[PDB]
Every structure is written in C-alpha cells, then in structure tokens.
Amino acid sequence: IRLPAHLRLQPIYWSRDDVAQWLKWAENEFSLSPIDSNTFEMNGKALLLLTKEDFRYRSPHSGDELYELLQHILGSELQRKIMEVELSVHGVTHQEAQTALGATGGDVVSAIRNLKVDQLFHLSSRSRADAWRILEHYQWDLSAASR
Ligand SMILES: [Cl-]
C-alpha cells in the first residue's frame, strides 16, 4: 500500500483539499467505484463526525470502504471522544481534552464535568467541592456561572 505523500495520517488536521486528496488516493489504491469529490465537501474534523450510514449516503458502493479505511488510519475512538469534549466546553483545547479524558479513563461524561468544574473553580475562592456541588445541583450546566 502506497500512501499519498504530503498527506499526514492525522485526519483531525485535514483540510477540504486534503479530504479530496485522500478520496482520490483511496479510489485508485483500492480500485473503488467512482467517487464524486463534490460529495465530501468538508474538512477532516467533519469527516470524523460522519457515521458509516452517512458515508454510504454519499457513496452507496464504496462509502463503507472509505469509513473502514478512515478507521484504520485513525487506529487504536480517542480522536472522536476529544471532539465531543471540545464540542461540550467553551475554551477547551485538544490537549486539555486529551488530558481530561486520560484522567477519567476514556469517560467523556466525567471529563466534560471535570473540565467544567475546572473552569468554574477558576473564578471563585470556593473549594472544588463547592464548585462540584453547584454544578451537580445545576445539572452540569456551566452557563450557570452567575456570581
Ligand atoms: Cl486524528
């Protein structure tokens, strides 16, 4: 298998042009059915949010192949969990999410909450338990940071 040079194996950083390059490469390297590049008008972050059915909607004949190819390029789930954390807490970066997820043992829910209490703790002299209490009381809504 010959990879397309100048295309890193980090799909979370792929541009729209990189997605088109990956599609063209995949169609030729795996002899797939013709893929209209106009059917994947998105960047790499968006590609990670598609389900296998979403791939099939765009390419009934080779969409699931492309999905499995993406899964193997990603390898041994974390990149998608990181995106879910980044989509749940304002101001959290890739590294902040990865640190929180590793602390919570892959738990997205606990990582989001630990990150939410961190942000709330960053604004008051209250103890972390008081921050954990207000957030548990307010159903884990960080928007209720009223003072
Ligand atoms: Cl990635």
Side-chain angles (χ1 to χ4, degrees), residues 3-7 11 13-15 17-32 34-36 39-40 42-44 46-52 54-75 80 82-83 85 87-88 90-95 97-108 111-113 115-118 120-123 127 129 131-133 135-137 140-142 144-145:
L3 287 174
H6 308 290
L7 183 65
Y13 300 115
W14 287 355
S15 78
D17 297 330
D18 300 324
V19 167
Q21 179 185 356
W22 172 73
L23 292 170
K24 303 165 187 176
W25 167 79
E27 178 183 324
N28 290 283
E29 182 65 25
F30 300 92
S31 300
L32 303 181
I35 308 175
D36 185 6
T39 64
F40 288 84
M42 70 192 65
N43 60 29
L47 201 62
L48 304 176
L49 296 180
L50 294 188
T51 66
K52 187 189 288 179
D54 299 334
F55 272 82
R56 292 193 169 118
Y57 163 76
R58 288 162 168 77
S59 177
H61 289 274
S62 67
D64 51 15
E65 175 69 32
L66 296 172
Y67 176 89
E68 311 292 356
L69 180 66
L70 176 62
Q71 297 291 83
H72 285 79
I73 292 178
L74 293 164
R80 294 199 178 83
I82 289 179
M83 288 188 61
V85 170
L87 284 171
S88 298
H90 282 279
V92 168
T93 73
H94 170 81
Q95 191 183 17
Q98 183 168 354
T99 300
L101 282 167
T104 64
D107 186 3
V108 177
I112 293 169
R113 295 173 184 182
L115 284 176
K116 279 179 180 175
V117 306
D118 285 359
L120 198 66
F121 176 85
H122 195 281
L123 298 175
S127 57
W132 276 97
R133 180 180 67 257
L135 219 63
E136 164 68 19
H137 170 235
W140 302 106
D141 181 20
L142 185 54

